Amino acid sequence: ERPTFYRQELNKTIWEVPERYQNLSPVGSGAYGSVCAAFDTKTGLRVAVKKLSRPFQSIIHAKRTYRELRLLKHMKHENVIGLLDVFTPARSLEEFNDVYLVTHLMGADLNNIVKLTDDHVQFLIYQILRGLKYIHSADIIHRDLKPSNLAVNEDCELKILDFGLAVATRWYRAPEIMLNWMHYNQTVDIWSVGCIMAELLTGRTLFPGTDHIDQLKLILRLVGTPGAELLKKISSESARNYIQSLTQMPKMNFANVFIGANPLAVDLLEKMLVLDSDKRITAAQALAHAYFAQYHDPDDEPVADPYDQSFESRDLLIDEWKSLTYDEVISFVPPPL
Numbered sequence: 121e122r123p124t125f126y127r128q129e130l131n132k133t134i135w136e137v138p139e140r141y142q143n144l145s146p147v148g149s150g151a152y153g154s155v156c157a158a159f160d161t162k163t164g165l166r167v168a169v170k171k172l173s174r175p176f177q178s179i180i181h182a183k184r185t186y187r188e189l190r191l192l193k194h195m196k197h198e199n200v201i202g203l204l205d206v207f208t209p210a211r212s213l214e215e216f217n218d219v220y221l222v223t224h225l226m227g228a229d230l231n232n233i234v235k236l237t238d239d240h241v242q243f244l245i246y247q248i249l250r251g252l253k254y255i256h257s258a259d260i261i262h263r264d265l266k267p268s269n270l271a272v273n274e275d276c277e278l279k280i281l282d283f284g285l286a287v288a289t290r291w292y293r294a295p296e297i298m299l300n301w302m303h304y305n306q307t308v309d310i311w312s313v314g315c316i317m318a319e320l321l322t323g324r325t326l327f328p329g330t331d332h333i334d335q336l337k338l339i340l341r342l343v344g345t346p347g348a349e350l351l352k353k354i355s356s357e358s359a360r361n362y363i364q365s366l367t368q369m370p371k372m373n374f375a376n377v378f379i380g381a382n383p384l385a386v387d388l389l390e391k392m393l394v395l396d397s398d399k400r401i402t403a404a405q406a407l408a409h410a411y412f413a414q415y416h417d418p419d420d421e422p423v424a425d426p427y428d429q430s431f432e433s434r435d436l437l438i439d440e441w442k443s444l445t446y447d448e449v450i451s452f453v454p455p456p457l
């Protein structure tokens with residue numbers, strides 16, 4: 121049956137949680153909720169508890185809430201955030217208005233952790249890529265990988281987050297996103313990883329654009345203007361004509377850009393940071409790159425179970441998304457101790 125709950129007020133709102141969770145302490149807030157650190161008396165683990173804000177205020181919010189819970193319920197991988205628990209104080213669908221998500225407490229994000237040694241870069245990028253192999257295998261694309269969406273502990277264990285605690289986002293974004301391309305490759309994320317890896321190696325933001333146009337300018341300086349091969353695939357006439365009006369520039373030699381870096385790191389960067397998304401290295405191919413030779417184990421880089429995202433194309437009523445979310449809360453099975 122239902123545990124007993126207790127109420128208290130934190131970050132200008134009421135938190136009602138199971139007694140099992142003790143010593144709540146705010147850690148931060150993001151765009152869709154706020155997070156407290158707590159002690160889970162059942163496991164002796166330190167956990168992060170996220171309370172969603174206004175989860176069912178509109179159709180938009182209600183579907184978002186559902187998307188988040190479905191996503192977090194599916195992730196079962198060491199380098200991806202997963203769900204220890206999900207709960208609501210509501211005893212029925214009728215009173216259901218609040219959702220709390222529980223995961224392992226992590227020490228810091230990669231913002232906060234950044235000068236790294238080459239071995240640390242290796243292990244951190246390895247883990248990112250291992251997590252990405254898993255997410256991508258389910259046909260999920262992150263789309264906003266950046267250092268504040270990557271949580272890390274003092275032993276350098278790393279997890280990909282859906283949303284961190286809120287460094288421009290545009291700095292890590294694939295150029296196709298900024299050109300508002302219709303559809304996206306799973307290697308929009310690889311671009312991001314390339315930007316992150318570069319920054320870990322050099323201690324400097326690779327492409328610190330002031331806006332999307334400045335961003336592309338900085339990108340094209342490094343990687344050069346598109347070639348005839350890439351122009352063949354651009355359906356937008358305005359994009360083509362503009363791209364072809366640019367003063368052409370050749371790709372820079374990355375060994376000179378990343379002076380002193382492990383040449384294996386440099387070689388990997390050159391495979392990530394290609395403008396043509398079809399030519400970027402995949403997360404699965406990257407894991408086998410020699411740069412990760414001390415960590416790569418092909419028998420321990422698993423794929424995910426298929427994930428059904430058909431709900432994304434449905435237009436439902438605010439109470440229907442709420443009821444579907446309530447069902448997900450009710451059917452949650454905790455992971456083993």
Ligand SMILES: CN1c2c(-c3ccc(F)cc3)n[nH]c2-c2ccccc2S1(=O)=O
Binds near residue numbers: 170224270272281283
């Ligand atoms: C995992 N947590 C989290 C979460 C989070 C996300 C979803 C949940 F269900 C619970 C926490 N978002 N951001 C953080 C986070 C970011 C940087 C360092 C530490 C943390 S956290 O441990 O509070």
Ligand SMILES: CCCCCCCCO[C@@H]1O[C@H](CO)[C@@H](O)[C@H](O)[C@H]1O
Binds near residue numbers: 350397
């Ligand atoms: C001026 C800089 C613009 C460079 C844009 C290059 C983006 C190229 O990547 C493109 O990604 C698409 C998936 O989104 C694919 O459908 C295309 O085949 C691929 O070439």
